[PDB]
Amino acid sequence: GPEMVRGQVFDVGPRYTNLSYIGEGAYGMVCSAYDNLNKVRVAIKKISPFEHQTYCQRTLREIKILLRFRHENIIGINDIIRAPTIEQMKDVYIVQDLMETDLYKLLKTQHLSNDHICYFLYQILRGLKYIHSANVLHRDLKPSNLLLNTTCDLKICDFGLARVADPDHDHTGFLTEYVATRWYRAPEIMLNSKGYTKSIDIWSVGCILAEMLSNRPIFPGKHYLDQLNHILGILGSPSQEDLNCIINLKARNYLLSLPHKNKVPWNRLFPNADSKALDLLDKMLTFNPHKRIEVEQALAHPYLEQYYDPSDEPIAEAPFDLPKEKLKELIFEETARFQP
Ligand SMILES: N#Cc1c[nH]c2ncccc12
């Protein structure tokens, strides 16, 4: 019969053998396995989305995006395992490079040298340049979605919440529900934004840089609105000019109702950080999303001068409602290339 792990079917053989439980992920069970063809261990994640339209959507999203992207700092899909027919297909297994660790695990246990911070940040931005060049937003950047190998090469993963950019339709009302991880949400999400612009991702990167500097999340909100007052507790009260950019009255009047808060200087928050790193941090964690630094400007910042080389920071060749039944079929078609 099929391979079993923790009392569950993990049906990947006979190419993949010698399975080891790694942990549970946003999709389900993740294991490592020996790839008898490439003579190397790999990671395999098991996905079971076919009962729910939303799951079908996140799965289809990830698969389509990862199959189209090809970049050193973005996790690829090596192989996809599933039944030969739709009728028999209950699960889909996604095979990817096995990576030693991730930035979430690393930050729990390891102090990062400035040299490491700088290299990790460069790689995150290099990958993000490619993603944004494809007119795609990742929308859930955070340490656990940044994989690292034994030599600290970094790969962005999990495109389950990704979307094509849609700035013309970004405006919404105050306190609009949002799905992406709370601690890494830009302030405008809580005020007047659907998170359909590239600036949403830059905010998340800024949060990640701050977290690398101190091993603690910079804005650890406990609930939707608490997130915003963590942010304001550090950046201080928005300027009149930045308030005037928020036309929605409920959002604006909420901000006006708050007592004045002073900005906390980055160098008091991070007294041993490199000054150039803090200058770049400030530009990524800018309150007004229109004034926030863009990915290519960030790559060109003096902090990253030892790595910056636009000719070696590639872009994508081209820019990138349905019921679950049509989705199961689309997943079936999208994964066909890996048969048998
Ligand atoms: N999902 C996923 C992974 C893709 N590669 C991995 N390496 C170590 C642990 C997890 C993974």
Residue span of the structural domain in which 60 resides: 1-98+323-340
- DSSP of 292-337: SPPHHHHHTSGGGTTT--GGGS---SS-----HHHHHHHHHHHTGG
46 lines ligand 1 (CB under 6 A): no
Tell me the C-alpha distance between 161 and 154, whole Å: 20
Please check whether residues 281 and 176 belong to one and the same domain. Answer: yes
98 lines ligand 1 (CB under 6 A): yes
CA 262 to each of CA 159, 211, 218, 259: distance values in angstroms, whole numbers, following the listed order: 36, 21, 16, 10
- The torsion defined by the Cα of 208, 273, 73 and 333, in degrees rounded to 10, comes to 0
Q: What is the amino acid identity at position 262?
A: N
Residue reference for tokens 């000054």: 275
Residue 304 contacts residue 118 (beta carbons within 8 Å) = yes
66 lines ligand 1 (CB under 6 A): no
Residue reference for tokens 């690393």: 106
Please check whether residues 251 and 210 belong to one and the same domain. Answer: yes
- DSSP of 13-62: TTTEEEEEEEEE-SSSEEEEEEETTTTEEEEEEEE--TT-HHHHHHHHHH
Q: Is 13 annotated as a binding residue?
A: no
Please check whether residues 302 and 329 belong to one and the same domain. Answer: no
Please check whether residues 120 and 134 belong to one and the same domain. Answer: yes
How many domains, in total, are found in the chain? 2
Rg (CA), the chain: 21
Tell me the C-alpha distance between 134 and 126, whole Å: 13
Write out the two tokens for 74. Answer: 């973005």
In the Cβ-directed half-sphere of 195, how many Cα atoms lie within 13 Å? 27
Tell me the C-alpha distance between 182 and 224, whole Å: 7
Please check whether residues 260 and 336 belong to one and the same domain. Answer: no
Please check whether residues 110 and 90 belong to one and the same domain. Answer: no
Query: Which stretches does DSSP call E strand in 130-173?
Result: 136-137, 146-148, 154-156, 163-164
* CB within 8 Å of 28: residues ≥ 6 apart: 45, 46, 47, 48
> In the sheet where 154-156 sits, what is the strand order?
101-102, 146-148, 154-156
Atom 8 (ligand 1): residue with closest C-alpha?
A: 99
Please check whether residues 338 and 223 belong to one and the same domain. Answer: no
- What pairs with residue 79 in β-bridges? 95
Please check whether residues 94 and 117 belong to one and the same domain. Answer: no
Single out the residue of 35, 32, 29, 24 nearest to residue 8, CA to CA. Answer: 29
Please check whether residues 141 and 211 belong to one and the same domain. Answer: yes
Please check whether residues 77 and 137 belong to one and the same domain. Answer: no
Q: Is 25 annotated as a binding residue?
A: yes
- What is the structure's resolution, reported in angstroms to one decimal? 1.5
Which CATH number does the domain housing residue 58 bear? 3.30.200.20
Technique of determination: X-ray
Going from the Cα of 75 to the center of ligand 1, the distance in angstroms, rounded, reads 9
Please check whether residues 65 and 125 belong to one and the same domain. Answer: no
From 156, 157, 158, give the residue whose CB has the most ligand 1 atoms within 8 Å, as the site to mutate.
Answer: 157
Among the listed residues 140, 158, 201, 242, the single catalytic one is 140
Write out the two tokens for 179. Answer: 């799905």
Which ranges constitute the DSSP H helices of the chain? 53-68, 103-109, 114-133, 199-214, 224-235, 240-244, 249-256, 266-269, 275-284, 295-299, 324-334
CA 307 to each of CA 70, 149, 284, 303: distance values in angstroms, whole numbers, following the listed order: 20, 19, 19, 9
Please check whether residues 197 and 66 belong to one and the same domain. Answer: no
Residue reference for tokens 């930050």: 107
**184: helix, coil or strand?**
helix
- What pairs with residue 171 in β-bridges? 193
Q: Is 233 annotated as a binding residue?
A: no
Residue reference for tokens 């608490």: 226
Q: Cα(first)–Cα(last) distance of the chain, in Å?
A: 19
Write out the two tokens for 277. Answer: 């790193």
Which CATH number does the domain housing residue 133 bear? 1.10.510.10
155 lines ligand 1 (CB under 6 A): no
Judge whether 274 counts as a catalytic residue.
no
| Residue 100 CA, closest ligand 1 atom number | 8
Q: What is the amino acid identity at position 305?
A: E
